[PDB]
From Swiss-Prot, chain A:
The chain holds residues 24 to 146 of 146 of the full protein. Transmembrane segments: none annotated. It comes from Protobothrops flavoviridis. Heterodimer with subunit A of IX/X-bp or IX-bp; disulfide-linked. One of its GO terms (cellular component) is extracellular region. Keywords: Blood coagulation cascade inhibiting toxin, Calcium, Disulfide bond, Hemostasis impairing toxin, Metal-binding, Secreted, Signal, Toxin. This is Snaclec coagulation factor IX/factor X-binding protein subunit B. The lineage of its organism: Eukaryota, Metazoa, Chordata, Craniata, Vertebrata. GO terms for molecular function: calcium ion binding; toxin activity. Expressed by the venom gland. The keyword Transmembrane does not apply. Residues 1-123 form the C-type lectin domain. Disulfide bonds join 2-13, 30-119, 96-111. Ca(2+) binds at residues 41, 43, 47, 120.
Amino acid sequence: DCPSDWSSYEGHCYKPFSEPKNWADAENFCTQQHAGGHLVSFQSSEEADFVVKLAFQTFGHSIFWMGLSNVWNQCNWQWSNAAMLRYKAWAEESYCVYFKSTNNKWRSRACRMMAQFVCEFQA
Amino acid sequence: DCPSGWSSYEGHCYKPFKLYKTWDDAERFCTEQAKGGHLVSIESAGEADFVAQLVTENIQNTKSYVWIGLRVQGKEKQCSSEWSDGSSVSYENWIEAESKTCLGLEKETGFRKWVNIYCGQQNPFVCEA
Ligand SMILES: [Ca+2]
Ligand SMILES: [Ca+2]
């Protein structure tokens, strides 16, 4: 059963917010929303759809964060001449996945930016 | 001193090409342009300023990126093992254009910065030998 402010799906509680916060902060914020809170993790298409229909009906149309960050940061990066990554000139330090109320698609925005978000916990 | 049309900087030759190819294709195209050729590798500050002067002085005629040799040599559309709650990320629905795994350069940033871009793009490039 979930707080009166949360929506229930398969033994989990999802609640979307509207205070644009960076990735780290929006993930900070979620742990303080309920014992075991964190940003939204989509373990499936069904769960992901439910969350999408949910963010829609509420705030109608905007971009929400998700439980993925430092996505490509630990990928194996090397130049095509076989050289290792040493010098750096990245325009953005890290990327964070985020979705938007229109569809269940994973997008990527620089982490240190701002967007809405959906928090979740279980039971 | 380099072949006709290549520019030199610290014992290497560079050639800006105004062909719109995918990363995979601009890379294959560079190997077959000189002995041991590849897409430019920016491994130093001076080297980067030089590639920027070059790209600016040569490519800048139709708004876009300029490929560079850096790429996640792998098949992971993302490489972050888990979600914030500590679960394994094993379900996906990425927009392909949205997994920005190849890098580029651009005028917006005076061709001095690496921008995460979609590998299926078709942009010019700089080869190096
Ligand atoms: Ca989940
Ligand atoms: Ca080089």
